[PDB]
Amino acid sequence: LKIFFPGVSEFGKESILFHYTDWVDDQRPENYREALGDVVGDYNFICPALEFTKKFSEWGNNAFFYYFEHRSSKLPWPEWMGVMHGYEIEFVFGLPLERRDQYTKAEEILSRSIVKRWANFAKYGNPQETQNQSTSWPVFKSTEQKYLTLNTESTRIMTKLRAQQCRFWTSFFPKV
Amino acid sequence: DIIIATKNGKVRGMQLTVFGGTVTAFLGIPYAQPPLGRLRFKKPQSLTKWSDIWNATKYANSCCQNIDQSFPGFHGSEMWNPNTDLSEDCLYLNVWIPAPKPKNATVLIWIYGGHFQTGTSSLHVYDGKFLARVERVIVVSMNYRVGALGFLALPGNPEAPGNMGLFDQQLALQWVQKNIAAFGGNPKSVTLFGESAGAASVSLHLLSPGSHSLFTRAILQSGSFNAPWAVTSLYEARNRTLNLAKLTGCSRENETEIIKCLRNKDPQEILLNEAFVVPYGTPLSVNFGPTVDGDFLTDMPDILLELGQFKKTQILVGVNKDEGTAFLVYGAPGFSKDNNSIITRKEFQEGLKIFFPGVSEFGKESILFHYTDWVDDQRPENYREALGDVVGDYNFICPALEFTKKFSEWGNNAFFYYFEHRSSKLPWPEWMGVMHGYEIEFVFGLPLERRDQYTKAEEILSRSIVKRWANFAKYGNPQETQNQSTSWPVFKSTEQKYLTLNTESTRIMTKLRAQQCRFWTSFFPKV
Amino acid sequence: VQKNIAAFGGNPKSVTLFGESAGAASVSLHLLSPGSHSLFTRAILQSGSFNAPWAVTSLYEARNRTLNLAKLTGCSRENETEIIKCLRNKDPQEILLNEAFVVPYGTPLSVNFGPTVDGDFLTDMPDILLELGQFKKTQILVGVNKDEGTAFLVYGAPGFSKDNNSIITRKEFQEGLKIFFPGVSEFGKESILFHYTDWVDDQRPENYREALGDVVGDYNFICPALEFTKKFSEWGNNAFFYYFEHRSSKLPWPEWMGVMHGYEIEFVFGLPLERRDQYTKAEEILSRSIVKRWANFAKYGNPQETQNQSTSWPVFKSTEQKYLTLNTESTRIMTKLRAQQCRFWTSFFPKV
Numbered sequence A: 001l002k003i004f005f006p007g008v009s010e011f012g013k014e015s016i017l018f019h020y021t022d023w024v025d026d027q028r029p030e031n032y033r034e035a036l037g038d039v040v041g042d043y044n045f046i047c048p049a050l051e052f053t054k055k056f057s058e059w060g061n062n063a064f065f066y067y068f069e070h071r072s073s074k075l076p077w078p079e080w081m082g083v084m085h086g087y088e089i090e091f092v093f094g095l096p097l098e099r100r101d102q103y104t105k106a107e108e109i110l111s112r113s114i115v116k117r118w119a120n121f122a123k124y125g126n127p128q129e130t131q132n133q134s135t136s137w138p139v140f141k142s143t144e145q146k147y148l149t150l151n152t153e154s155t156r157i158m159t160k161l162r163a164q165q166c167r168f169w170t171s172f173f174p175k176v
Numbered sequence B: 001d002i003i004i005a006t007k008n009g010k011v012r013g014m015q016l017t018v019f020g021g022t023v024t025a026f027l028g029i030p031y032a033q034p035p036l037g038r039l040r041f042k043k044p045q046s047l048t049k050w051s052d053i054w055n056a057t058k059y060a061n062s063c064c065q066n067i068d069q070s071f072p073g074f075h076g077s078e079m080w081n082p083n084t085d086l087s088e089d090c091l092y093l094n095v096w097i098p099a100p101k102p103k104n105a106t107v108l109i110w111i112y113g114g115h116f117q118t119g120t121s122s123l124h125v126y127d128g129k130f131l132a133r134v135e136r137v138i139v140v141s142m143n144y145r146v147g148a149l150g151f152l153a154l155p156g157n158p159e160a161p162g163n164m165g166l167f168d169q170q171l172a173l174q175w176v177q178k179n180i181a182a183f184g185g186n187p188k189s190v191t192l193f194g195e196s197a198g199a200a201s202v203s204l205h206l207l208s209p210g211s212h213s214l215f216t217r218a219i220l221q222s223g224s225f226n227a228p229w230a231v232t233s234l235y236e237a238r239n240r241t242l243n244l245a246k247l248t249g250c251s252r253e254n255e256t257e258i259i260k261c262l263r264n265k266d267p268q269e270i271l272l273n274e275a276f277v278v279p280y281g282t283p284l285s286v287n288f289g290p291t292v293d294g295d296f297l298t299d300m301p302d303i304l305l306e307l308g309q310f311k312k313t314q315i316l317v318g319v320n321k322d323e324g325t326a327f328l329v330y331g332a333p334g335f336s337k338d339n340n341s342i343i344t345r346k347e348f349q350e351g352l353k354i355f356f357p358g359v360s361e362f363g364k365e366s367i368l369f370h371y372t373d374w375v376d377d378q379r380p381e382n383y384r385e386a387l388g389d390v391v392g393d394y395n396f397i398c399p400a401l402e403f404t405k406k407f408s409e410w411g412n413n414a415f416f417y418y419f420e421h422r423s424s425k426l427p428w429p430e431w432m433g434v435m436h437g438y439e440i441e442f443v444f445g446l447p448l449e450r451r452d453q454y455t456k457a458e459e460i461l462s463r464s465i466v467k468r469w470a471n472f473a474k475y476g477n478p479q480e481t482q483n484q485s486t487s488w489p490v491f492k493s494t495e496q497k498y499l500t501l502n503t504e505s506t507r508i509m510t511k512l513r514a515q516q517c518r519f520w521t522s523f524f525p526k527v
Numbered sequence C: 001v002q003k004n005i006a007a008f009g010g011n012p013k014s015v016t017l018f019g020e021s022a023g024a025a026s027v028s029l030h031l032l033s034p035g036s037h038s039l040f041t042r043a044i045l046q047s048g049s050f051n052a053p054w055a056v057t058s059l060y061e062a063r064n065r066t067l068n069l070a071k072l073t074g075c076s077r078e079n080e081t082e083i084i085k086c087l088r089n090k091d092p093q094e095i096l097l098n099e100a101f102v103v104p105y106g107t108p109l110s111v112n113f114g115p116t117v118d119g120d121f122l123t124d125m126p127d128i129l130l131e132l133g134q135f136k137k138t139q140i141l142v143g144v145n146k147d148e149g150t151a152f153l154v155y156g157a158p159g160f161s162k163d164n165n166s167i168i169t170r171k172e173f174q175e176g177l178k179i180f181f182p183g184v185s186e187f188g189k190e191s192i193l194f195h196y197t198d199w200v201d202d203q204r205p206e207n208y209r210e211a212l213g214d215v216v217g218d219y220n221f222i223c224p225a226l227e228f229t230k231k232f233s234e235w236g237n238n239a240f241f242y243y244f245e246h247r248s249s250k251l252p253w254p255e256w257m258g259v260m261h262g263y264e265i266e267f268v269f270g271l272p273l274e275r276r277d278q279y280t281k282a283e284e285i286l287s288r289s290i291v292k293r294w295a296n297f298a299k300y301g302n303p304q305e306t307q308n309q310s311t312s313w314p315v316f317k318s319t320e321q322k323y324l325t326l327n328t329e330s331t332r333i334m335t336k337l338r339a340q341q342c343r344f345w346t347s348f349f350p351k352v
């Protein structure tokens, strides 16, 4: 925490520890390893993205929010690093469409669908895959806060990503 | 020493040590005339009544039943077999009360499953002591007649009118109405809960006008009366009563004479033939079950449900993630508990003949079509996975969801769960996943017991299930209010929210198996 | 009262309970008790409610305390009924003398011996019953005073005196917290300091003095009253909330103590109606109006003064949370009392 919040008071840093290390529960040695990943991701990336989306949409525009959760079968970083920062890009640009490239078939399918959704968004302002019986992507409103999960198995409609964590970063932490 | 005075007389119980405190148990209190000789197949008649102390200190006789012998020596299946003598003398119940004795406690009544052909209340995973200790509720469970001895039917005729085992249940609820105040219980706060055929039974007590005033609320685990296996048509119940008489050489002419012949046959002869009164049985077969008797059940239950003729109250309904897997090892080709059961397309197609014996060719093609559009890899575990899903969706999940929509449309709060934790002790292999029947130990609180070798995470999940179930009984709202738990939303049509139960993170989700159930609920009834 | 009040002219079907502090927590518990449901109609809670941190003892600590008392009186037995039996021989002075230290760290707010979940009067933890709407359905009138906390500061917070203005330093505030939150972690206590000492701003020496009063009042009185009111009203009943803000012109405690805990009572019972008593005229008027409102509440379930063109008192709903201020000058309709402070006590602090 000293590395990531150089200063930042002692109490400030205690409060991160308190809100991310209430154990649920086993011990479970990968526990502090997992929490520190979550602290850095929640604070730097996820919570401000969600807060931008609420604020922007409150002024009447359609917004669409995704949660990308596939770990690339080619990733050269190890397992405990999971679905890393930056590793959706190859999906968006369609590299798994290239068969010589040694991606799985499932990965090809997921890319083709990301590409369609991104492109329908550019041309139409609506990122649906309309033809192959895909899950419909709902607009993000405050109150409900629906978002779509992207993975090789099953896309889901979920609500309120990191609700607990972002209450911490967005309303408590600015004050330290 | 602990004597309670009931209406029929005195009963003595025993004290048990449980997690540093104490529970009082009364095991095997009689609740009807044993149904022997002249009373076989008749409804349960009321107890003669006694003097002196009846010692309710050990479990009683389980009801006569055929035993599962496909995996002898194997804990995964022998855990469901009876663990007291079998006998026609089997109409008994159990009570666990907190200590100190409560003032006016809520009561949970368990009704076991067993496809209506088996089951017993004295099983380890049905032991009510933990719930009594931990949540200070009183827990009750009863033995009821199963198989032909409990559900043989020749409707009209009171010599064998159908539904006997359901009336056994009803009369046990009755006992609780008259007697539970003496043990500290509130007869005005009773929740029925049950699993599989037990869950279908509880659902039928919601339809029965004679049960309306015997309970408050209901919990249905993996089972409901609209499931395809739950009610026998009057038509097939005759074909089966007659097929049994023929087989035992009891074929008479005057109907009451058939029943009379059957009362001389020793019970082994009747169990031995029960098995093939159906010309094509499945691992899901219910040879002898509930019927529209015109007494317990006054019309086809699909109709009563659709037209809102049930008791108005709160229900809690839920299902497990892999309901179907367990039935695949009782006869689907290519399946084994002793290997990963990768199966081919031919084996899947054949699998369907086992589970939909007839059922047309087109009917069966249509299941294949809707469950084998590949997404995608190949992925050899693909047909193995689909067949599990077909059997679970059709038999368990889709009718549970359809029951919940229909019930809630008439204005009552409903709560739906999706149980998705595989027990770290499960003796069946990995590919079987979160099996049918393996939430029960969670509900009764076995992982609360530390010597038992469950994980800590599993202890936590149990403690939370127990609280939610108990808050449901006492309050009609299954929240865990104190430890910052996820709130459980009511199930309405339109949105259809439900709660997932697992060791990591509970989630609010919507529209479980939307695609699959559109298939089973609107397309398939027509084949 | 149920059996006998008809003989004295009273309507046993029109009974309102009212009480202050532990009295208010008691009335709130009669709303939870199934044996009290049919013994009253409506309820008035002044500065107190059963969800206050001082109101219910856990079964756990009640044992530690029953056992600590037996030990102290030399009554330590083995068979439990034998402990009680020993205790019945002790003369009552011996029992009062030891009561004081069955807790290893007491506060000026200490409740050595209190309500517990007995499984008779009270069948479950009351937080749960409240949350899940298991209480008598009726109208309530709930309210609090502007400076609830000040009175407890002179029973042991360092630097405080009724005989001076009690300007205190930051070190004395921090120490004050050890007196009121004996344990309670370091981080817990830092978090109170952080949320009550962000200065707005001058310095302003009465600043830490003022904050400590506010901490003790918000935590012990105001925030649980407001939280009780939201929860109760969410189940469909009319609720009425007041904020009492008049300092009695006769108060014998000094100025910096403000509108103290307990000093609305004389107003409710109508002492300023008595002219010989040396209250101001304005105070007489305010009492007469409180009396009418309380009495209209008992008889009608609506605490209006209908005749003298008084301010209408709106019902408290969640969302808007309107309440009425009571003072000698002007009654106001306000919204969301201590919004910021109670977010702290109600959602953050339970977790430490």
Ligand SMILES: *[C@@H]1O[C@H](CO[C@H]2O[C@@H](C)[C@@H](O)[C@@H](O)[C@@H]2O)[C@@H](O[C@@H]2O[C@H](CO)[C@@H](O)[C@H](O)[C@H]2NC(C)=O)[C@H](O)[C@H]1NC(C)=O
Pocket: B239, B243, B246, B247, B276, B277, B278, B279, B280
């Ligand atoms: C209603 O009754 C007969 C019962 O026939 C059965 O006799 C039992 C004692 C038992 O051993 C069983 O296996 C046997 O089949 C059914 O007719 C039978 O149906 C099968 C297949 O259609 C034929 O191959 C049998 O030979 C035939 N037997 C007789 C004597 O007719 C009948 O199908 C059944 N109705 C239903 C809906 O299942």
Ligand SMILES: *[C@@H]1O[C@H](CO[C@H]2O[C@@H](C)[C@@H](O)[C@@H](O)[C@@H]2O)[C@@H](O[C@@H]2O[C@H](CO)[C@@H](O)[C@H](O)[C@H]2NC(C)=O)[C@H](O)[C@H]1NC(C)=O
Pocket: B332, B333, B334, B335, B336, B338, B339, B340, B341, B342
């Ligand atoms: C998994 O096992 C099944 C089940 O039947 C078998 O049990 C095995 C553990 C093994 O002991 C085997 O000898 C025993 O028959 C296998 O299915 C069987 O496959 C063979 C094909 O030659 C036939 O003899 C059987 O008809 C067939 N029976 C049944 C009832 O399924 C299955 O092949 C095997 N799969 C694996 C290991 O991947």
Ligand SMILES: *[C@@H]1O[C@H](CO[C@H]2O[C@@H](C)[C@@H](O)[C@@H](O)[C@@H]2O)[C@@H](O[C@@H]2O[C@H](CO)[C@@H](O)[C@H](O)[C@H]2NC(C)=O)[C@H](O)[C@H]1NC(C)=O
Pocket: C064, C068, C071, C072, C101, C102, C103, C104, C105
């Ligand atoms: C439950 O009980 C003991 C009680 O100890 C106390 O004995 C009383 C008679 C009284 O005089 C009291 O002041 C005294 O402390 C508690 O253990 C005590 O805790 C303190 C601080 O932790 C220690 O310094 C004491 O020496 C210790 N005494 C003994 C005999 O163990 C215990 O803490 C208490 N539980 C709670 C939650 O407060």
Ligand SMILES: *[C@@H]1O[C@H](CO[C@H]2O[C@@H](C)[C@@H](O)[C@@H](O)[C@@H]2O)[C@@H](O[C@@H]2O[C@H](CO)[C@@H](O)[C@H](O)[C@H]2NC(C)=O)[C@H](O)[C@H]1NC(C)=O
Pocket: C157, C158, C159, C160, C161, C163, C164, C165, C166, C167
């Ligand atoms: C206000 O008075 C307090 C209270 O204690 C004191 O009461 C005073 C009225 C006075 O008679 C004083 O002699 C008596 O001790 C003062 O707090 C005290 O401060 C002195 C510091 O030297 C210490 O002796 C005490 O430990 C301390 N005690 C307590 C219990 O608070 C306080 O300083 C004073 N403040 C003023 C006048 O602004």
Ligand SMILES: *[C@@H]1O[C@H](CO[C@H]2O[C@@H](C)[C@@H](O)[C@@H](O)[C@@H]2O)[C@@H](O)[C@H](O)[C@H]1NC(C)=O
Pocket: B103, B104, B186, B188, B189, B216, B474, C034
């Ligand atoms: C025991 O409580 C009785 C009523 O309690 C229940 O009221 C029901 C209508 C339903 O709301 C239940 O869930 C309630 O908990 C009361 O009538 C009895 O007189 C009580 N008897 C005692 C204490 O002996």
Ligand SMILES: *[C@@H]1O[C@H](CO[C@H]2O[C@@H](C)[C@@H](O)[C@@H](O)[C@@H]2O)[C@@H](O)[C@H](O)[C@H]1NC(C)=O
Pocket: C011, C013, C014, C041, C299
């Ligand atoms: C006295 O009045 C009785 C009822 O008055 C009350 O009705 C309650 C239900 C509640 O609304 C109260 O606030 C009402 O004021 C009536 O039944 C009695 O018979 C009356 N008795 C007399 C005049 O002797």
Ligand SMILES: *[C@@H]1O[C@H](CO)[C@@H](O)[C@H](O)[C@H]1NC(C)=O
Pocket: A112, A113, A116, A129, A131, A132
């Ligand atoms: C949809 O259609 C074809 C097969 O019919 C499939 O291969 C393709 O990848 C899918 N299209 C999109 C845009 O995902």
Ligand SMILES: *[C@@H]1O[C@H](CO)[C@@H](O)[C@H](O)[C@H]1NC(C)=O
Pocket: B055
């Ligand atoms: C029932 O239980 C007690 C055991 O202590 C025994 O002494 C009593 O006589 C028993 N009654 C029987 C066996 O009928």
Ligand SMILES: *[C@@H]1O[C@H](CO)[C@@H](O)[C@H](O)[C@H]1NC(C)=O
Pocket: B254, B255, B256, B257
């Ligand atoms: C059949 O015999 C029974 C048995 O005693 C008798 O009561 C009944 O009246 C008879 N009915 C017919 C139609 O033979």
Ligand SMILES: *[C@@H]1O[C@H](CO)[C@@H](O)[C@H](O)[C@H]1NC(C)=O
Pocket: B463, B464, B467, B480, B482, B483
């Ligand atoms: C909630 O509280 C305690 C710890 O404070 C915990 O151990 C317990 O298991 C939780 N209660 C429930 C009902 O899950």
Ligand SMILES: *[C@@H]1O[C@H](CO)[C@@H](O)[C@H](O)[C@H]1NC(C)=O
Pocket: C079, C080, C081, C082
């Ligand atoms: C304790 O003694 C009491 C007091 O007479 C008696 O009634 C009770 O049965 C005894 N219990 C134990 C466990 O010694």
Ligand SMILES: *[C@@H]1O[C@H](CO)[C@@H](O)[C@H](O)[C@H]1NC(C)=O
Pocket: C288, C289, C292, C305, C307, C308
């Ligand atoms: C209203 O009326 C009179 C004067 O008209 C006044 O003195 C009295 O105190 C007021 N009544 C109430 C209930 O406050």
Ligand SMILES: [Cl-]
Pocket: A133, A134, A135, A154, A155
């Ligand atoms: Cl999809």
Ligand SMILES: [Cl-]
Pocket: A159, A160, B508
């Ligand atoms: Cl939600």
Ligand SMILES: [Cl-]
Pocket: A160, A161, A162, A163
């Ligand atoms: Cl999340």
Ligand SMILES: [Cl-]
Pocket: B321
């Ligand atoms: Cl799934």
